[PDB]
Design a protein around this ligand. Sequence first.
Ligand SMILES: */C(=C/C(=O)OC)C(=O)O
Lengths: 333, 333, 333, 333
Amino acid sequence: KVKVGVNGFGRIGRLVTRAAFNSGKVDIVAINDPFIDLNYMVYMFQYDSTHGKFHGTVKAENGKLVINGNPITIFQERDPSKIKWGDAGAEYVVESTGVFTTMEKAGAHLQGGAKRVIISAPSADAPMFVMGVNHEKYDNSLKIISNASCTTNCLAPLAKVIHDNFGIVEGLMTTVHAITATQKTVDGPSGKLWRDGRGALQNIIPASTGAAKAVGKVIPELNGKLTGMAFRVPTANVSVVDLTCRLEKPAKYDDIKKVVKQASEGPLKGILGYTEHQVVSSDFNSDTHSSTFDAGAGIALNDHFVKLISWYDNEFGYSNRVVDLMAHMASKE
Amino acid sequence: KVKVGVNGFGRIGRLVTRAAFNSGKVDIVAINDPFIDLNYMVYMFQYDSTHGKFHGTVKAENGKLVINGNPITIFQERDPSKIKWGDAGAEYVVESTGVFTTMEKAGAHLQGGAKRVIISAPSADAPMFVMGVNHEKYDNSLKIISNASCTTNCLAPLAKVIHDNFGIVEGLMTTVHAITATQKTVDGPSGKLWRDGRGALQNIIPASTGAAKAVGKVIPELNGKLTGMAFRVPTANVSVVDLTCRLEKPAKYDDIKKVVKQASEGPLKGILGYTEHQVVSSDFNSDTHSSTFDAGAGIALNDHFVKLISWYDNEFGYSNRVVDLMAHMASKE
Amino acid sequence: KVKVGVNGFGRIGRLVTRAAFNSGKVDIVAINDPFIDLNYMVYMFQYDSTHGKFHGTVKAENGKLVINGNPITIFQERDPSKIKWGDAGAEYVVESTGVFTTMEKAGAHLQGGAKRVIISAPSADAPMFVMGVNHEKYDNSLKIISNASCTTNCLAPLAKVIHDNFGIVEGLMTTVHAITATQKTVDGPSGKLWRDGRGALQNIIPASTGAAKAVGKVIPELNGKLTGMAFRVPTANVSVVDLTCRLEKPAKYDDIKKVVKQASEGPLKGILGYTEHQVVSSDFNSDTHSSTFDAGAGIALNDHFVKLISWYDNEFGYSNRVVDLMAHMASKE
Amino acid sequence: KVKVGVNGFGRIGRLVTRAAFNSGKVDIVAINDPFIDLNYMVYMFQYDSTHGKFHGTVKAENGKLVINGNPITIFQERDPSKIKWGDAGAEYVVESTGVFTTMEKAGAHLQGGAKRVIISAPSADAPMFVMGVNHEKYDNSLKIISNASCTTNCLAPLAKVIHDNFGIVEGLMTTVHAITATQKTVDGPSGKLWRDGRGALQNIIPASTGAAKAVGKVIPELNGKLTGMAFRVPTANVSVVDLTCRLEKPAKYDDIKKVVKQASEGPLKGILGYTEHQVVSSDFNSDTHSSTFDAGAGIALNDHFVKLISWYDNEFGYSNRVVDLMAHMASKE
Ligand SMILES: */C(=C/C(=O)OC)C(=O)O
């Protein structure tokens, strides 16, 4: 129903576009990317190494990108304040470039005639939302908004269920993470973060992340009670969260499984998944959940100290939540 | 000095053999493998995808394996009771097939005339040792010994230092582990461990391990205080330990750093390393340490709750610790 | 309509089974595998790293494997002679273990009451068929038959169109091939084929193949005019043929492209594909074509000396041809 | 003896530097790179994922890079016309950025006081050389020179031996090539070459190359008689040439082995290699040959039509030829 514009046609930009057409929950009417012209967009959207060929039509017709017969207006504007969102009829804009994450920069989209702006990344100052955790706190007064990180959309729905039930005294998270566009194929320059320059095919690579800490802004009761870090490993897609956490109320592993499977079939349905199957990462390729709890993989030392494992397609899970949020925003207009 | 026989020319057999000649600490004089003919042994020892071409000479000469000029006796004996280790003059036998890990099956090497057996794997009942942790607890009465698991040999020297200075109340360990010979190139049969059957190039694979619980047996104070699990990731070699633990005494991160660094210079030198460098996994390929503490990669929630990172070359570190163990058993005969 | 048994639930067995239900061209009524129980068959069939989760339903129910509501008799017989194919109504048996490839060993399925046997591998003596090339030479006298290799099914349809139109004086093929179930994760034992034991993730591995020479059996006019070799490379699936051939009659690259495009739209449709798109290997993952000509990747030196590139999903292409071969066999009884 | 400056501290710039210090054939006195400051250089040079950690000493000392006690002056200029090579005393400049490969752009180094420039890539107009093939046609008049490409350096020495002895009438070349710094970790923008945009870990990627044709410039007799293409595969390093050629004089395979072994032992020593071992790509990691002919991997259809296989470390071999070419240039001053 709501008409959407996407700034940036990267993995997130294209996969949000793909998720909008598959779910039908929003309508993509404009795309802006200064480094990908229209024919190149046809090709980049049609063919995907990770998620296969688009099931649908995609063609260049009279200067438009046409997907499933729906023409999309294309801008090639390096400055966000110069994108005529309002001319193209784009009410919400997905800011997915990764370089306009502050409320000051992301706000440029309001100049072109856009009413609301969703940042597809963590934000220093924009209010962060995670579907099924704190989305119901959104209101019409917020015009610039963040959907947090993929890792945050994994840990947070799991953290919520475990806090609400047994209470998290303190937790340390490791994410074993698929490679991303920011890494390099062979040892190369990554001036800010030296490890991230090292060959992504050859290396387990330790990285910093604020994704755990950030759970404290979508679940305030956990503020200052979570942090962690990442290992980038050589797979194309799908990441796993490893949450090590002390609970204050006693929790048998079967209890943890009981409450998580309850949440998965009830209000967190389609956001937090549950499985007892002998799954590996490629089993969650193109899986739309934010988080799928892996019963068999985790381990408890005692009733108050556990290791919990949850899978997430860092590409497809996150992109589907960016669509799910925009549909909630538009239901509350 | 002590004359060693190796059962099984697998990854461990060849690299134990390789580390022997490189360190000179022991003298290899026999190999038994019944699926690998002498000519094939030349090639498999000469060429290594992970550790590069053997720096030295290897040839098949008059039915022996001649490495740097030292002729080695070759057996093709499917049954260990039937290997004449004594005739060949092998004081110690390394038991590296991974199927003779119980004291009963391992003992067969004594029938052939060997006096001692080192098991290059965890054992149900054979006594386990970790260099730098309980190797002095070894005495001439023991004739069937285990050198534990490569993972235990990474976690133990770190647990020891941390527990010595701060006390470990409890810990949960994740190891992000390189692929091994037991895994498959594509989805294949692993009847008892369905996940280890899934294609190793495609998948992050969750796995059970006893390496953390095993640390209870070489540091008895830690018995019942540690467990863990592993992820298999598509890299050829080098693995990392992620120890989340609670300490009863306050430990500022700079205090954890000082003590581990101080241990690495002192009694534990060459077993536990210390680094502040921006390292990635391949920086440790063919590194002879058991455990290298990674200062920058670790993170602390607070003075009591820490996530500590240690690298290990699961192939080369472990193989050097088997050679080291046998060296120490010789210094006390 | 024709009722089919599968011997071996390996990569080919399961994907032949998957292709039978997806296409609906045959009915799988029976499977034999001595190393894979009923339960484990549910999991291996349902979850696939390469081709994703089975679209449809799979459960164990009353000792039978139930796919899309169709029950399947499960045998655990090591000896092919002793499989009661006739009691379960298996008229054709797919011999997919790759250890019963001779007409003598393959005949063993007729003992248990099967009428016809399709070896899902090349055979030393059994007549070999390629769909769209020589499958019309099949008749009812034949009971033991081979569907050739995945590589022959890629090369033969292209070779046919090139020979038909311009005449192949001679040619040499390279296949750059994805990793298979016979390779090793780390340097391991491969006594017949020393290169094939070197670690499949680390290495480009040269290999011998008879697949180019076998095109001489399905197109007798090319007997003695083709040979070739392979490189194994670290991808899970999808391979490519590289055909360097001399042409009798003069052929500009544009004429080659026309006749290949024509053949792909006409009598070789669904078997030979044709594309001018900027494709890469993963664009053919789960592509059911035997052979897809890549127009942009090929190059001519001159009107008589050219290099032609053709993609093949070595798993899913070949598996669909086995079902197509059996369906054509049912039509001619 | 000759003093050398390196423009660009990428894979080629660092490994030429590494080869200069290990062979001792030239002295690196200066390095320019605008995106990599002094302390970053110490790290990127010290630790290499492919070639291992540097064997020697490297430190930042008083604004100079000090390698094995030799201090190196570190520029940070974007416009080569403004590097003060003269003042640092760099007589030869290695132009290794990839963006200054024309005589006019590379000529900019002469304005800074350098006397000659070696382009470490193919050039549109600068004369190209391959050591062991046409390097003796260099003379003191040439101030701007190209060292051709890693692939040309592999094909040219093999093509010269085959052509000197049997006569190359026509050849088509495929190179199966390791991933490079121009590729992407996941599907990403590559506006001029769309296939090079697709995820390098997931894909066999066809590509154009002028390497086989360029052989016609260093061996004028084969001008217009060679061309080829490439496939990029997911390995970190080491590539292979696949040469399908037709000969004028008859050549049994054993005659081809004989004359290639002969040239590898005699005047092409250290440039062209020869082996009969069951080698795989990793067996050539850090191998310094231009080309190693793999006798067992190649195949003949007949005495006039053969496919020949030659391996090359596309990073280390090429880097060592750059040092060698500068050693030759210094000798003819
Ligand atoms: C072709 C190779 C392959 O990938 O097999 C699964 C074939 O098997 O027929």
